[PDB]
Design an enzyme around this catalytic site. Structure first.
Site, mmCIF file in Angstrom:
data_model
loop_
_atom_site.group_PDB
_atom_site.id
_atom_site.type_symbol
_atom_site.label_atom_id
_atom_site.label_comp_id
_atom_site.label_asym_id
_atom_site.label_seq_id
_atom_site.Cartn_x
_atom_site.Cartn_y
_atom_site.Cartn_z
ATOM 1 N N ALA A 170 -11.075 1.563 -11.401
ATOM 2 C CA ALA A 170 -10.229 2.585 -12.008
ATOM 3 C C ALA A 170 -9.025 2.930 -11.134
ATOM 4 C CB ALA A 170 -11.036 3.835 -12.308
ATOM 5 N N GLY A 171 -8.440 1.914 -10.507
ATOM 6 C CA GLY A 171 -7.222 2.099 -9.741
ATOM 7 C C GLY A 171 -6.019 2.099 -10.662
ATOM 8 N N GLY A 172 -4.840 1.860 -10.100
ATOM 9 C CA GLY A 172 -3.629 1.792 -10.897
ATOM 10 C C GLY A 172 -3.709 0.686 -11.935
ATOM 11 N N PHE A 203 14.125 0.047 0.926
ATOM 12 C CA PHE A 203 12.825 -0.435 1.369
ATOM 13 C C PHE A 203 12.984 -1.829 1.962
ATOM 14 C CE2 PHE A 203 8.167 0.208 0.832
ATOM 15 C CZ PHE A 203 8.152 1.583 0.957
ATOM 16 N N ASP A 233 -15.386 -6.089 -3.236
ATOM 17 C CA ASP A 233 -16.516 -6.374 -4.110
ATOM 18 C C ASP A 233 -16.143 -7.417 -5.157
ATOM 19 O OD1 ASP A 233 -17.707 -4.439 -2.616
ATOM 20 O OD2 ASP A 233 -17.920 -2.970 -4.230
ATOM 21 N N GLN A 245 -1.574 -9.219 4.761
ATOM 22 C CA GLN A 245 -0.403 -8.477 5.205
ATOM 23 C C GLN A 245 -0.768 -7.360 6.171
ATOM 24 O OE1 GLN A 245 2.286 -5.581 2.608
ATOM 25 N NE2 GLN A 245 3.341 -7.526 2.988
ATOM 26 N N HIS A 279 0.688 -4.241 7.729
ATOM 27 C CA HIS A 279 1.784 -3.283 7.666
ATOM 28 C C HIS A 279 2.276 -2.968 9.077
ATOM 29 C CE1 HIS A 279 4.170 0.242 6.641
ATOM 30 N NE2 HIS A 279 4.032 -0.088 5.370
ATOM 31 N N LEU A 297 -1.832 4.943 7.649
ATOM 32 C CA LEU A 297 -0.493 4.433 7.371
ATOM 33 C C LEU A 297 0.595 5.504 7.355
ATOM 34 C CD1 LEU A 297 1.476 2.143 6.254
ATOM 35 C CD2 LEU A 297 0.865 3.051 4.007
ATOM 36 N N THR A 328 4.461 5.581 5.799
ATOM 37 C CA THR A 328 5.234 4.790 4.840
ATOM 38 C C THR A 328 6.420 4.034 5.436
ATOM 39 O OG1 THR A 328 6.545 4.861 2.794
ATOM 40 C CG2 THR A 328 6.572 6.817 4.187
ATOM 41 N N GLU A 329 6.713 2.883 4.843
ATOM 42 C CA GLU A 329 7.886 2.094 5.189
ATOM 43 C C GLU A 329 9.131 2.857 4.746
ATOM 44 O OE1 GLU A 329 7.763 -2.237 5.074
ATOM 45 O OE2 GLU A 329 9.325 -2.186 3.535
ATOM 46 N N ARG A 375 7.856 -7.736 6.072
ATOM 47 C CA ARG A 375 6.769 -7.111 6.819
ATOM 48 C C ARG A 375 6.093 -8.063 7.803
ATOM 49 N NH1 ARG A 375 3.781 -3.107 2.366
ATOM 50 N NH2 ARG A 375 5.332 -1.422 2.538
ATOM 51 N N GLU A 418 -4.783 -5.752 -6.908
ATOM 52 C CA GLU A 418 -4.903 -6.353 -5.584
ATOM 53 C C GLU A 418 -6.087 -7.314 -5.483
ATOM 54 O OE1 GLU A 418 -5.019 -3.540 -2.418
ATOM 55 O OE2 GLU A 418 -5.093 -5.060 -0.835
ATOM 56 N N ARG A 425 3.899 -9.874 0.679
ATOM 57 C CA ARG A 425 4.287 -8.948 -0.374
ATOM 58 C C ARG A 425 5.396 -8.008 0.084
ATOM 59 N NH1 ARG A 425 3.055 -3.795 -1.844
ATOM 60 N NH2 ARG A 425 1.492 -3.580 -0.179
ATOM 61 N N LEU A 437 2.355 -1.567 -6.496
ATOM 62 C CA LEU A 437 2.253 -0.598 -7.580
ATOM 63 C C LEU A 437 2.919 -1.135 -8.844
ATOM 64 C CD1 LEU A 437 2.814 2.842 -5.804
ATOM 65 C CD2 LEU A 437 0.686 1.624 -6.314
HETATM 66 C C1 LIG Z 1 -3.892 1.289 1.605
HETATM 67 C C2 LIG Z 1 -2.512 1.580 1.090
HETATM 68 C C3 LIG Z 1 -1.934 0.744 0.146
HETATM 69 C C4 LIG Z 1 -0.657 1.015 -0.331
HETATM 70 C C5 LIG Z 1 0.045 2.120 0.134
HETATM 71 C C6 LIG Z 1 -0.537 2.958 1.077
HETATM 72 C C7 LIG Z 1 -1.814 2.687 1.556
HETATM 73 C C8 LIG Z 1 -2.439 3.592 2.578
HETATM 74 N N1 LIG Z 1 1.316 2.379 -0.347
HETATM 75 C C9 LIG Z 1 1.886 1.545 -1.290
HETATM 76 C C10 LIG Z 1 3.161 1.799 -1.782
HETATM 77 O O1 LIG Z 1 3.792 2.772 -1.376
HETATM 78 N N2 LIG Z 1 3.719 0.954 -2.718
HETATM 79 C C11 LIG Z 1 3.015 -0.142 -3.174
HETATM 80 O O2 LIG Z 1 3.516 -0.892 -4.011
HETATM 81 N N3 LIG Z 1 1.749 -0.397 -2.690
HETATM 82 C C12 LIG Z 1 1.181 0.440 -1.751
HETATM 83 N N4 LIG Z 1 -0.081 0.179 -1.262
HETATM 84 C C13 LIG Z 1 -0.843 -1.001 -1.772
HETATM 85 C C14 LIG Z 1 -1.292 -0.573 -3.162
HETATM 86 O O3 LIG Z 1 -1.321 0.838 -3.209
HETATM 87 C C15 LIG Z 1 -2.663 -1.110 -3.523
HETATM 88 O O4 LIG Z 1 -2.672 -2.512 -3.393
HETATM 89 C C16 LIG Z 1 -2.962 -0.737 -4.967
HETATM 90 O O5 LIG Z 1 -3.101 0.661 -5.086
HETATM 91 C C17 LIG Z 1 -4.229 -1.430 -5.449
HETATM 92 O O6 LIG Z 1 -4.601 -0.898 -6.700
HETATM 93 P P1 LIG Z 1 -5.880 -1.517 -7.441
HETATM 94 O O7 LIG Z 1 -6.106 -0.813 -8.757
HETATM 95 O O8 LIG Z 1 -5.706 -3.002 -7.638
HETATM 96 O O9 LIG Z 1 -7.078 -1.213 -6.404
HETATM 97 P P2 LIG Z 1 -7.562 0.296 -6.112
HETATM 98 O O10 LIG Z 1 -6.439 1.280 -6.304
HETATM 99 O O11 LIG Z 1 -8.134 0.388 -4.719
HETATM 100 O O12 LIG Z 1 -8.717 0.517 -7.205
HETATM 101 C C18 LIG Z 1 -9.912 -0.223 -7.118
HETATM 102 C C19 LIG Z 1 -10.968 0.424 -8.000
HETATM 103 O O13 LIG Z 1 -12.071 -0.449 -8.149
HETATM 104 C C20 LIG Z 1 -13.265 0.304 -8.072
HETATM 105 N N5 LIG Z 1 -14.392 -0.509 -7.585
HETATM 106 C C21 LIG Z 1 -14.465 -1.233 -6.424
HETATM 107 N N6 LIG Z 1 -15.677 -1.829 -6.369
HETATM 108 C C22 LIG Z 1 -16.376 -1.494 -7.478
HETATM 109 C C23 LIG Z 1 -17.651 -1.821 -7.921
HETATM 110 N N7 LIG Z 1 -18.428 -2.622 -7.203
HETATM 111 N N8 LIG Z 1 -18.102 -1.314 -9.122
HETATM 112 C C24 LIG Z 1 -17.291 -0.490 -9.877
HETATM 113 N N9 LIG Z 1 -16.028 -0.171 -9.428
HETATM 114 C C25 LIG Z 1 -15.578 -0.665 -8.250
HETATM 115 C C26 LIG Z 1 -12.963 1.464 -7.145
HETATM 116 O O14 LIG Z 1 -13.728 2.590 -7.508
HETATM 117 C C27 LIG Z 1 -11.495 1.720 -7.400
HETATM 118 O O15 LIG Z 1 -11.364 2.749 -8.348
HETATM 119 O O1 LIG Z 2 4.861 1.584 3.641
HETATM 120 C C1 LIG Z 2 4.609 2.040 2.476
HETATM 121 O O2 LIG Z 2 4.975 3.115 1.932
HETATM 122 C C2 LIG Z 2 3.643 1.204 1.694
HETATM 123 O O3 LIG Z 2 3.085 0.302 2.650
HETATM 124 C C3 LIG Z 2 4.291 0.442 0.534
HETATM 125 C C4 LIG Z 2 3.730 -0.785 0.090
HETATM 126 O O4 LIG Z 2 4.296 -1.249 -0.916
HETATM 127 O O5 LIG Z 2 2.721 -1.347 0.660
HETATM 128 NA NA NA Z 3 -3.756 -9.987 -4.399
#
Ligand SMILES: *Cc1cc2c(cc1C)nc1c(=O)[nH]c(=O)nc-1n2C[C@H](O)[C@H](O)[C@H](O)COP(=O)(O)OP(=O)(O)OC[C@H]1O[C@@H](n2cnc3c(N)ncnc32)[C@H](O)[C@@H]1O
Ligand SMILES: O=C([O-])[C@H](O)C=C([O-])O
Ligand code: NA
Ligand code: HEM
Ligand SMILES: CC1=C(C(=O)Nc2ccccc2)SCCO1
Ligand code: SF4
Ligand code: F3S
Ligand code: FES
Lengths: 105, 588, 238, 122
Positions: free
Chosen positions: B15-17, B119, B221, B240, B242, B252, B254-255, B286, B388, B399, B405
């Site tokens: 339930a991410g983005g 950026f 997972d 990657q 950062h 982290l 931010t960039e 990066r 991701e 990336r 996002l």
């Molecule tokens: C770590 C990070 C990444 C990040 C960022 C800052 C930080 C600290 N800032 C960003 C930014 O400014 N701009 C950008 O473009 N990217 C940025 N990132 C990277 C990016 O945020 C992430 O790659 C992105 O949010 C990933 O989203 P995604 O939907 O693909 O993954 P998620 O948000 O982590 O959600 C995963 C969901 O899956 C569920 N899950 C996991 N395992 C299970 C199992 N086994 N069963 C059921 N559900 C599961 C999790 O609960 C979660 O909701």
């Molecule tokens: O540095 C950030 O704000 C963050 O790291 C952005 C991405 O896209 O990963």
């Molecule tokens: Na990927």
């Protein structure tokens, strides 16, 4: 509704604040409280009206206030309605008793 | 069936983005959908995204999605699929404006339009002047995005199974994915989620490292489930790092700090990025910035102190006002985890594991891919992937900041828009037998029955140390070979690991043990892939093979689970609306 | 140096009733770790200890706990701010909500109130924008201090009014969210929202106790928001 | 059924919370106090004899204390009640600091009125 209560509570709050200032004013400036000066103060038309007005304000203020307390701590319906009955009756009694007391002074 | 069966048209695991955008589109398309997540939806790692969303809106200045495509293609060091990248940058604007109409609280320009900040890897006119196309809501964009999407899922009445843990994919005798088994964290009940479409959106796996910016729940997972199901993963060696994680904390910053005018300094006060990247400077790729920092430290020009070896990120010259307005998030983070006030003093930063460029190979439709005995691509019937966890690939070997996002929204929506056609294309899937479903529980059953095994904590820490030492920013043949052997040993210890908590009511120990299996699978796939690619491209840097090899390695790496071996897939270089960007030397 | 804890424990399949258990953790003398750091390490010795956590950076709002009598996030609460000579660091679940297991509470009612105020943009569609809705910096600033909510429930689980009527009183967090959309220039259903907040419970159960403001890890002020809502309710229904 | 943590003795309460719960208590007490004040008033007005009788009752030390309590509870309810209305009309800020500051000032003002109430009763 919620807005109606909020207003009534503040409306009566303003009235009772003025009444308290009025009653305190007298007490704080009368010296020896002889039976004569006491009955003269409560014989005034201004005192009678202001006092009865205050009793009506207390009715509204107290009823809304107590209703909020009961709905917070008293869950059982039957018990709460009975407590609200006693409270409301008592408040109405206050006003009525006020009429009997002042009308005969 | 002696196990509850919950049937849906689509089952979105995560339930991410990406997951919530997909579920939103799938539901609006007229299909039933179950949204799974091992945490409350708004607790996903997306919530921590800061910088913003890179997209060619053209608000801050006249822009062009082709300019964005160029930056992306170059940024990926030319192994990013150009047809996929074209789709993302072209579709971007509409997809992002759509979020704004959802109520996303973007920051605003004076004229009322969405605010865009500079950026890394952003230029005009195909590698020209610095650009600014990262739409942001202060530095809490990920927070704003995730909550807006959850709010939209609420308004849409999406069926959400919160705090349910996906165990393993379920395959029928035809080799098609027909759902997955899940563990209800609260009650302990295990259920088979039957579906015509299983969408993996489980996020990254930065936790395979000793130091990461990722949340504790990023355990890959999705990678583990894919591997154990026979599904291959791609470009797993492309991790990657950062440039600016808080030294000694990993948290982290931010960039956007450098996008607003901040720059890096060494112990001598030199803005060294001017030397490593004369053009883009502190806003270079990066992979380049990360190495530049490590070279400074490695050669004794890094700063020291309570935080450990690091570089200084100067921001104070921007002023209190701009800092509190555009970067309030990093003000709190720095003060809390570094005891440093950015308004007065530079932030201690060091490259930290951040994003997984690799993952499950997918088409633009989200359909998961595998290869046959001939090496040809064939769709895995019933399996999908977005976010991701996916390897489209639109990020290649590196990336760009803000592209993740964008990736989540564009391809999460894409998977939804094309779900009906994908299901009709794959045809009716045969029912899974009772043994098919039972096979998905083998991994769970082992833990439940192991009491006297090894301590999983020691296994996790050994795994993370191995990846940190032998698969970080700089890599070498000898070290990676030993790291691989160590992982084999560690993987054997895990086969006899114990579960000390046998309860069923919200047993988090069982969850984290199950997660460990996925850390192992992700770590191993990464190691094998790293040793495989004998060249230096993007974030993958080897001393024994320091050059980029376009003759032998202009392609993707592919980890085959059943043979535990490596192979290669073609990089797409045929855009539909413009000519492909030819591979050239990559400098900033 | 040695650290001592008193932690809330409960397992429906084992415990007849909740209980407090003593914990000890050797810590680095000249190093200040967060409470979450301690909890994670305690689980290494006692694998049965259950609690929520994720972002460990005070953004996700997973690890809301009652520490030494006051609500907050374990991931950003330093051990030094809890440690007192002679006394144990007391850790208990957020007050008011059903306890599922150990330090894990059922946030159902908290989310329910959040949904009751319809936390999503309501635009009637008339006068659509060419691209994105045009919102001046002035209008956008009205959202500051409102949209940052991480739904950690620290405020609501500290509000007595929420304790007594969790199913009728929207609570600090929920009302903060309600106002978040009430003053969003892009939302066109202000009057409709207000008409659903005129009853005696939804908003007016707030009596400026101000437990919400003091505990909010993000430094938000639900009380002021609720105050603004009350004004709007008066301007419309008085 | 599930247990909940609502052991009030294990929870921190700021000065603002204390001031609030006292305002509710003072309100309930004043509700009962009105009846007692009315009962006293009615007696002191029925006849010349009733007044002397009312004076005698006020002579009792135990009654002096109770009367002081009633006036104190009323004084608090009025002052803190105005504090409330001052926030409702924007005369007071709704920040935590302003909340503390106004609460402490309310206590002081109440203590003063409580003493003046003592003087009026001796
Ligand atoms: C770590 C990070 C990444 C990040 C960022 C800052 C930080 C600290 N800032 C960003 C930014 O400014 N701009 C950008 O473009 N990217 C940025 N990132 C990277 C990016 O945020 C992430 O790659 C992105 O949010 C990933 O989203 P995604 O939907 O693909 O993954 P998620 O948000 O982590 O959600 C995963 C969901 O899956 C569920 N899950 C996991 N395992 C299970 C199992 N086994 N069963 C059921 N559900 C599961 C999790 O609960 C979660 O909701
Ligand atoms: O540095 C950030 O704000 C963050 O790291 C952005 C991405 O896209 O990963
Ligand atoms: Na990927
Ligand atoms: C004269 C007899 C009075 C009685 C019996 C009485 C009783 C009450 C009660 C029971 C409440 C409810 C408090 C709660 O729910 O916690 C209340 C509220 C209130 N009272 Fe009175 N009151 C009286 C007079 C006054 C006066 C003179 C004032 C002067 C300001 C006043 C101001 C207020 C205010 C502002 C509230 C609102 C409380 C809130 O919103 O939290 N009252 N009253
Ligand atoms: C719910 C409420 C109050 C209350 O219940 N306060 C409270 C009760 C128990 C413990 C601390 C405070 S006092 C102000 C009126 O509203
Ligand atoms: S208002 Fe503050 S304490 Fe309440 S849920 Fe939001 S972030 Fe948490
Ligand atoms: S604590 Fe509760 S009473 Fe109002 S001021 Fe905060 S919501
Ligand atoms: S762990 Fe995410 S807020 Fe404490």
């Amino acid at each position: 509704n919620g807005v109606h209560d909020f207003i009534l509570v503040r409306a009566t709050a303003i009235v009772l604040t003025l009444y308290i200032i009025y009653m305190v004013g007298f007490f704080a400036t009368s010296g020896e409280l002889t039976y004569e000066v006491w009955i003269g103060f409560f014989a005034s038309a201004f005192t009678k009206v202001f006092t009865l007005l205050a009793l009506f304000s207390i009715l509204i203020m107290a009823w809304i206030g107590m209703w909020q307390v009961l709905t917070d701590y008293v869950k059982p319906l039957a018990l709460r309605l009975m407590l609200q009955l006693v409270i409301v009756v008592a408040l109405v009694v206050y006003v009525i008793y006020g009429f009997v007391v002042v009308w005969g002074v | 069936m002696k196990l509850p069966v919950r049937e849906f048209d689509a089952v979105v695991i995560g339930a991410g983005g990406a997951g919530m955008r997909a579920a939103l589109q799938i539901s609006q398309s007229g299909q039933t959908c179950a949204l799974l997540s091992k945490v409350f939806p708004t607790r996903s790692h997306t919530v921590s995204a800061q910088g913003g969303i890179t997209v060619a809106l053209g608000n801050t200045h006249e822009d062009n999605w082709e300019w964005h495509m160029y930056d992306t293609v170059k940024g990926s060091d030319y192994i990013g699929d150009q047809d996929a990248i074209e789709y993302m940058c072209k579709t971007g604007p509409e997809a992002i404006l759509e979020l704004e109409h959802m109520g996303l609280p973007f920051s605003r320009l004076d004229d009322g339009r969405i605010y865009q900040r500079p950026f890394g890897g952003q230029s005009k006119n195909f590698g020209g002047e610095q650009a600014a196309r990262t739409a942001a809501a202060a530095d809490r964009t990920g927070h704003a995005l995730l909550h807006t999407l959850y709010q939209q899922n609420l308004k849409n009445h999406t069926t959400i199974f919160s705090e349910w843990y996906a165990l393993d994919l379920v395959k029928n005798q035809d080799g098609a994915v027909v759902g997955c088994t899940a563990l209800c964290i609260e009650t302990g009940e295990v259920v088979y989620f039957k579906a015509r479409a299983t969408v993996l959106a489980t996020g990254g796996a930065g936790r395979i490292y000793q130091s990461t910016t990722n949340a504790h729940i990023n355990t890959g997972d999705g990678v583990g489930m894919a591997i154990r199901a026979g599904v291959p993963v791609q470009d797993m060696e492309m991790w990657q790092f950062h440039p600016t994680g808080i030294a000694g904390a990993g948290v982290l910053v931010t960039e956007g700090c450098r996008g607003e005018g901040g720059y890096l300094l060494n112990k001598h006060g030199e803005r060294f990025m001017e030397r490593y990247a004369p053009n883009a400077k502190d806003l270079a790729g990066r992979d380049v910035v990360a190495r530049s920092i490590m070279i400074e430290i490695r050669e004794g020009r890094g700063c020291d102190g309570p935080w450990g070896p690091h570089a200084k990120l100067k921001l104070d010259h921007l002023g209190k006002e701009v800092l509190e307005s555009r970067l309030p998030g990093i003000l709190e983070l720095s003060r809390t985890f570094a005891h440093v006030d950015p308004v007065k003093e530079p932030i201690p930063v060091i490259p930290t594991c951040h994003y997984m460029m690799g993952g499950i190979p997918t088409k633009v439709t989200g359909q998961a891919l595998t290869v046959n005995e001939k090496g040809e691509d064939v769709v895995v019937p019933g399996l999908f992937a977005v976010g991701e966890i996916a390897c489209v690939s639109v990020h290649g070997a590196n990336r760009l900041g803000g592209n993740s996002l964008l990736d989540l929204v564009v391809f999460g929506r894409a998977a939804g828009l094309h779900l009906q056609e994908s299901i009709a294309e794959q045809g009716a899937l045969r029912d899974a037998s009772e043994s098919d479903v039972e096979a998905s529980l083998d991994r769970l059953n082992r833990w439940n029955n192991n009491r006297n095994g090894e301590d999983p904590v020691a296994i996790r820490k050994a795994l993370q140390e191995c990846m940190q030492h032998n698969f970080s920013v700089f890599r070498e043949g000898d070290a990676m070979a030993k790291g691989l052997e160590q992982l084999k040993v560690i993987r054997e210890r895990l086969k006899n690991a114990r579960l000390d908590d046998t309860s069923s009511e919200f047993n988090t120990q069982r969850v984290e043990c199950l997660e460990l299996d996925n850390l192992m699978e992700t770590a191993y796939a990464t190691a094998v892939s790293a040793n495989f690619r004998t060249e230096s491209r993007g974030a993958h840097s080897r001393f024994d093979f320091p050059d980029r090899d376009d003759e032998n390695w202009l392609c993707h790496s592919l980890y085959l689970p059943e043979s535990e071996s490596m192979t290669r897939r073609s990089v797409n270089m045929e855009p539909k609306l413009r000519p492909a960007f030819p591979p050239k030397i990559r400098t900033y | 140096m040695r650290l001592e804890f008193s932690i809330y424990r409960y397992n429906p399949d084992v415990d007849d009733a909740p209980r407090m258990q003593d914990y000890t953790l050797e810590a680095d003398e000249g190093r200040d770790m967060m409470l979450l750091d301690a909890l994670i390490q305690l689980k290494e010795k006692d694998p049965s200890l259950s609690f929520r956590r994720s972002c460990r950076e005070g953004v996700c709002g997973s690890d809301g706990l009652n520490m030494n009598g006051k609500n907050g996030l374990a991931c950003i609460t330093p051990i030094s701010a809890l440690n007192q000579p002679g006394k144990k660091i007391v850790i208990r679940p957020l007050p008011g909500l059903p306890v599922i297991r150990d330090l894990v509470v059922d946030m159902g009612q908290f989310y329910a109130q959040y949904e009751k105020i319809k936390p999503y943009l309501l635009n009637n569609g008339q006068n659509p924008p060419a691209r994105e809705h045009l919102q001046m910096p002035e209008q956008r600033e009205k959202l500051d201090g409102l949209y940052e909510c991480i739904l950690c429930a620290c405020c609501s689980t500290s509000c007595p009014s929420f304790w007594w009527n969790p199913d009728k009183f929207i609570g600090p967090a929920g009302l903060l969210a309600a106002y978040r959309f009430l003053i969003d220039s892009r939302d066109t259903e202000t009057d409709s929202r207000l008409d659903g907040l005129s009853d005696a419970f939804s908003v007016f159960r707030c009596h400026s106790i101000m437990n919400c403001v003091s505990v909010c890890p993000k430094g938000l002020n639900p009380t002021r928001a609720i105050g603004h809502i009350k004004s709007m309710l008066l301007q419309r229904n008085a | 059924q599930r247990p909940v943590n609502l052991d009030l003795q294990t929870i921190r309460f700021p000065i603002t919370a204390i001031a609030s719960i006292l305002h509710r208590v003072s309100g309930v007490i004043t509700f009962v106090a009105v009846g007692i004040l009315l009962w006293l008033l009615g007696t002191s007005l029925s006849s010349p004899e009733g007044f002397e009788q009312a004076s005698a009752i006020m002579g009792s030390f135990f009654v002096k204390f109770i009367m002081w309590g009633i006036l104190t509870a009323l004084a608090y309810h009025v002052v803190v009640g105005i504090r409330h209305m001052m926030m409702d009309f924007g005369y007071l800020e709704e920040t935590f600091e302003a909340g503390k500051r106004s609460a402490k000032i309310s206590f002081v003002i109440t203590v003063v009125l409580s003493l003046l109430a003592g003087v009026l009763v001796w």
